[PDB]
Design a protein around this nucleic acid. Structure first.
Lengths: 404, 519
DNA sequence: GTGGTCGTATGCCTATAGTTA
RNA sequence: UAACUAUAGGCAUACGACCAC
């Protein structure tokens, strides 16, 4: 056991759940009560934590998810300053990365007596017929940042025979292993570590971090240009001047002299062709003055393009992107506006952990009421990223669609 | 008895509030009651040991008492309840020193008592009572899963699908279990009949209904009328309140005596007709699917009725304040749908199948071009007299042979004077002056003049992002007496196609010099 | 540096309806 | 006089974005 305390100086409302989800959570909570994981508490506890139900692929059954987002902000001094997890810069460069879930490992180690009251959660009822079943964690919960911090002292010891054998990174309840081995070799070496987990007693998903190469923004290659083609081009590039200081539209604007029709064909001169071709070279080459800052928070913004196309940007400061790209669609069967966004958010979050090791602030083009209802249906990950809901400008939407 | 441990707030001591002036007439009666409470074992005698005092009003103590988790935040809606054959209602140590209270002539020592049980009018009294009741009912709920028991404050609602002979016997078995702990419950003859009065609702085993709602009146009386209409909106489908709300845009005055307008009394008179005929609600059945229907009754107003069987409504309602000034008849409909979708999760626990007054052709056209994402899983098309319709759609590519219109507007906030003009490729130009206007309004006037003078096929070029954003959407509101003229013009036209400012673009430069000549 | 216009979010206040102490 | 839920208004702050000087 280890004493845990809050930040000096420093209760969330439960979101309504479906009739099927509530009955599923009751079944899990009753099983965990008999095992000695959680216990019932009275109304004297004012602290509350949101609870949601998610589905798995391998287990096929329902999984319990607790949103410790509000609690993790108050417990930031414990798992970062007091017991911080070291992050290497060599994880981002590998051939194949495999992710495994080890969330069942935290259900064994007991929790601090004085800190148990802050992990309390309430199960909601249909039409508020029953007062609502109350529970609190007796052991280390999934989704809490203090759980891997306490287990760290035991996690380094069990990974020592594995590290000495092969000259790995832990984040939340997920484990990240990177290797430069072959396709057939990678699957065997992961099983060797998986069989080692069973020795201690605890229990097509594959990543390629070298294939995350940033795709450059390409400009339309046109044989014959019209006034309307220039006007749309100048407007897009002038907005992109604050991102890339190399882009200029001065010679493209001198092509338009006086009032002209949009259909009118304008031939590109020596000034226009040489400027436009130079601007294409600046878009292909990475921009200068972009660096990672550990002190500042990471921001991620996603835009909807339509026809099953989504684009995203990862940045710390506006107009200064560290990682860009576009997630099209999980092609095939049934995909909607929520599902394609849910699959994108989880993919961006996973990429953020490998390279940097922090969850970014998600800017979403969706309403608060619409997102909070349907996000649980397609959610699989145990980590909950902090999100906000904002407006999407027309200029940013028309720029990142030209990205290859 | 199993007592619940209760503490106080981190840095506050007990109440040191003194007693009020004498009464004598009430004190003589208070001694007789307190002696009976002491004899039963509710209160005990104390001396100079206790420094805490309470005048019984526990207003000061509750501010010092710890925060307890919600007893019941959201009240159960009669539509979410299940239909039953027979229903029966039943009417029912360290912290003890803080509940001490003092009772003749000039600051006498006073009688000292302290509560041993839960005192009424406190903070954690209803919280512990329900928590203790849930533990007592647990064995009965497991032994009898066929019956449904609901708890509210002190009253208990028991309902089952069993026969009247079998139902009456099970209530007596429930009474004997409660009497073990020491809870008094009324007998068969003292039990209340099926017309139950709860939260204003008159409950019945098969249906549910609300209590009957019954000169230039003052401002707050309008607010009294709005509150009654809002309360009736859950069962009465056709309720219009917006015109009375527009009268409530007034400020402060308690007795302003606001007169009615013709349109305000028009919707007020028809709402009287709706309240005339008595209506009833239907209970939820887990086997049948939920069906909701949407109707557009007017400007920024939507009404819905949720039913499992036709003409048998479970719950009705309204939606008015969806988004700001820019509405879009498709988006505001979806915002109304999302409100019911979340409402159905709370009440029934499942998403309903919608029947919208919008075609699948229009639904797909809007959400593909719009930036905001949304999802409606199950919805169908139903033709209604006020059908939702998209008026116009702008061209994707420039029109050949069409007259080009370079347009721009400029204004200054000093004296509030603005100019709007246009320059064509053929040579046509016009410059006008406006009074009491801004940059956003002058640019809006510029497009109206561009659609007023032009032909059928038009190519309009503008430098503003504000002016481009409005027309690209479909504003259905009283906002901009100007935009309503712009929309009306765009319907008349066959095809309409619609740049950075101060960049030196040909066409845009010539207009800017004309509008900002005196500005 | 100032003002106006859109969107999100927070706060608290004036009122009402249902209910309770 | 206060609290819980719902609805109708107004004011203030902050952020994202836009315009003018």
């Amino acid at each position: 056991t280890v004493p845990v305390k809050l930040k000096p100086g420093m209760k969330v409302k439960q979101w309504p759940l479906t009739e099927e989800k509530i009955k599923a959570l009751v079944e899990i909570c009753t099983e965990m009560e008999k095992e000695g994981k959680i216990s019932k508490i009275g109304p004297e506890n004012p602290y509350n934590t949101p609870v949601f139900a998610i589905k798995k692929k391998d287990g096929t059954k329902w999984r319990k998810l607790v949103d410790f987002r509000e609690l993790n902000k108050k417990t930031q001094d414990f798992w970062e300053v007091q017991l911080g997890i070291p992050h290497p810069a060599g994880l981002k460069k590998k051939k194949s990365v495999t992710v495994l879930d080890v969330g069942d490992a935290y259900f064994s180690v007991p929790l601090d007596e004085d800190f148990r009251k802050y992990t309390a959660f309430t199960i909601p009822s249909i039409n508020n017929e029953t007062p609502g079943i109350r529970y609190q964690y007796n052991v280390l919960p999934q989704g809490w940042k203090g759980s891997p911090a306490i287990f760290q002292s035991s996690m380094t010891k069990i990974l020592e025979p594995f590290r000495k054998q092969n000259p790995i990174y832990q984040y939340m309840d997920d484990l990240y292993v990177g290797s430069d081995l072959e396709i057939g070799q990678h699957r065997t070496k992961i099983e060797e570590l998986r069989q080692h987990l069973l020795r201690w007693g605890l229990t097509g998903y594959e990543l390629h971090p070298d294939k995350w190469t940033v795709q450059p923004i390409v400009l339309p290659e046109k044989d014959s240009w019209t006034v309307n083609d220039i006007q749309k081009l100048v407007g897009k590039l002038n907005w992109a001047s604050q991102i890339y200081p190399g882009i200029k539209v001065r010679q493209l604007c001198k092509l338009l002299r006086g009032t002209k029709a949009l259909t009118e064909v304008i031939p590109l001169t020596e000034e226009a062709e040489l400027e436009l071709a130079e601007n294409r070279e600046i878009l292909k080459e990475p921009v200068h003055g972009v660096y990672y800052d550990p002190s500042k928070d990471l921001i991620a913004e996603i835009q909807k393009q339509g026809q099953g196309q989504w684009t995203y940007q990862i940045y710390q400061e506006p107009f200064k992107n560290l990682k860009t790209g576009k997630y099209a669609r999980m092609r095939g069967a049934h995909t909607n506006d929520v599902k394609q966004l849910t699959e994108a958010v989880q993919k961006i979050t996973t990429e953020s952990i490998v390279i940097w090791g922090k969850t970014p602030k998600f800017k979403l083009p969706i309403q608060k009421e619409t997102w909070e209802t349907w996000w649980t249906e397609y959610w699989q990950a145990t980590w909950v990223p902090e999100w906000e809901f904002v407006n999407t400008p027309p200029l940013v939407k028309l720029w990142y669609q030209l990205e290859k | 008895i199993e007592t619940v441990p209760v503490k106080l707030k981190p840095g506050m001591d007990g109440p040191k509030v003194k007693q009020w002036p004498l009464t004598e007439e009430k004190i003589k009666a208070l001694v007789e009651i307190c002696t009976e409470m002491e004899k039963e074992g509710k209160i005990s005698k104390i001396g100079p040991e206790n420094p805490y005092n309470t005048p019984v009003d526990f207003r000061e103590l509750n501010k010092k008492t710890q925060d307890f988790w919600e007893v019941q935040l959201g009240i159960p809606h009669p539509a979410g309840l299940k239909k039953k054959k027979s229903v029966t209602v039943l009417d029912v140590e360290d912290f003890r020193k803080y509940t001490a209270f003092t009772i003749i002539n000039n600051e006498t020592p006073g009688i000292r008592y302290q509560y041993n049980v839960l005192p009424q009018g406190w903070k954690g009294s209803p919280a512990i009572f329900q928590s203790s009741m849930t533990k007592i009912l647990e064995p009965f709920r497991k032994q009898n899963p066929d019956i449904v028991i609901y708890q509210y404050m002190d009253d208990l609602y028991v309902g089952s699908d069993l026969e009247i002979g079998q139902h009456r016997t099970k209530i007596e078995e429930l009474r004997q279990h409660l009497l073990r702990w020491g809870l008094t419950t009324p007998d068969k003859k003292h039990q209340k009949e099926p017309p139950f009065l709860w939260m204003g609702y008159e409950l019945h085993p098969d249906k549910w209904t609300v209590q009957p709602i019954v000169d230039s009146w003052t401002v707050n009386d309008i607010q009294k009328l709005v509150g009654k209409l809002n309360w009736a909106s859950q069962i009465y489908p056709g309720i219009k309140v917006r015109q009375l709300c527009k009268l409530l845009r007034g400020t402060k005055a308690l007795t302003e005596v606001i007169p009615l307008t013709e349109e305000a009394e028009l919707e007020l008179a028809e709402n009287r007709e709706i309240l005339k005929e008595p209506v009833h609600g239907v209970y939820y059945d887990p086997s049948k699917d939920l069906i909701a229907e949407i109707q557009k009754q007017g400007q920024g107003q939507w009404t819905y009725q949720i039913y499992q069987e036709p003409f048998k409504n479970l719950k009705t309602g309204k939606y008015a304040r969806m988004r700001g000034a820019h509405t879009n008849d498709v988006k505001q409909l979806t915002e109304a749908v999302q409100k019911i979708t979340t409402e159905s999760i709370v009440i029934w626990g499942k998403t309903p199948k919608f029947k919208l007054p919008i075609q699948k052709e229009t639904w797909e056209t809007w959400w593909t071009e719009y930036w905001q994402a949304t999802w409606v899983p199950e919805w169908e098309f139903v033709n209604t007299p006020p059908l939702v319709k998209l008026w116009y759609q702008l061209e994707k590519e420039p029109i050949v042979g069409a007259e080009t219109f370079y347009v721009d507007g400029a204004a200054s906030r000093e004296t509030k004077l603005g100019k709007a003009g246009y320059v064509t490729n053929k040579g046509r130009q016009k410059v006008v002056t406006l009074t009491d206007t801004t940059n956003q309004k002058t640019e809006l006037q510029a497009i109206h003049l561009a659609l007023q003078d032009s032909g059928l096929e038009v190519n309009i070029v503008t430098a503003s992002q504000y002016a481009l954003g409005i027309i690209q959407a479909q504003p259905d509101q009283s906002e901009s007496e100007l935009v309503n003229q712009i929309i009306e013009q765009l319907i008349k036209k066959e095809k309409v196609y619609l740049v950075p400012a101060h960049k030196g673009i040909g066409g845009n430069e010539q207009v800017d010099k004309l509008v900002s000549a005196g500005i």
